[PDB]
Amino acid sequence: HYIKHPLQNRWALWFFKNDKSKTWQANLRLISKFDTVEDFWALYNHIQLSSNLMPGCDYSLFKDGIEPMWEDEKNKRGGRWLITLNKQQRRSDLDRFWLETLLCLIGESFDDYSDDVCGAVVNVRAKGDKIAIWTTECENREAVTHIGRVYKERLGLPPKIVIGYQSHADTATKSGSTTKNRFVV
Ligand SMILES: CN1CN([C@@H]2O[C@H](COP(=O)(O)OP(=O)(O)OP(=O)(O)O)[C@@H](O)[C@H]2O)c2nc(N)[nH]c(=O)c21
Ligand SMILES: O=C(O)/C(Cc1ccccc1[N+](=O)[O-])=N/Nc1nc(-c2ccc(Br)cc2)cs1
Helix, strand or coil, X not given: CCCCCEEEEEEEEEEEECCCCCCHHHXXXXXXXXXXHHHHHHHHHHCCCHHHCCCCEEEEEEECXXXXXXXXXXXXXXXXXXXXXXXXXXCCXXXXXXXXXXXXXXXXXXXXXXXXXXXXXXXXXXXXXXXEXXXXXXXXXXXXXXXXXXXXXXXXXXXXXXXXXXXXXXXXXXXXXXXCCCEEC
């Protein structure tokens, strides 16, 4: 006799394939949804590792009903904690960071503040991979800095590796690299 173990939230995994020829939203696809521990692992164990995705592709894991784009009602006032990897971190760090990030999401690791969490995004880029946790209100300093502190610790980043929180509104009018930060931790 085997019962499934429900998650606190239902989650959706999305795939993105870069193509600057096409409008951004056109490049996004919903893959599938899950709401149990068992189904999370069945999906994770089945699918390609972030380290193996083609340059230009993304995975996003977002709460059911939130599309992984700035436009969504739950993101437009929000922002993201951004982890930028160097080229050598592609191997034997990207996959660890991504799984630890997924587990922060589906395990509701930020306690009461996990409610402010929208999802997480991994960008596979030749320039330097990126992982981010998206939250719903960029002006909620308490929530945002709590999530950032816990997240940085969970990933075991050295203290002197400083990570930044960008508002999506700023990002949409510049670039995630040249975007100035609202917060650091
Ligand atoms: C998250 N993005 C990204 N994006 C478009 O896609 C561009 C590239 O964003 P990105 O893929 O997140 O990062 P990256 O490829 O490393 O490029 P960059 O250095 O400009 O940040 C952005 O400059 C923006 O024009 C978006 N466009 C819309 N309409 N909604 C969105 O949510 C997003
Ligand atoms: O053109 C490609 O390269 C595409 C199709 C695509 C997708 C988005 C936008 C455009 C296009 N396109 O150009 O046709 N790849 N699709 C992929 N799906 C997965 C995938 C992985 C795990 C699970 Br579980 C299910 C699916 C990996 S790559």
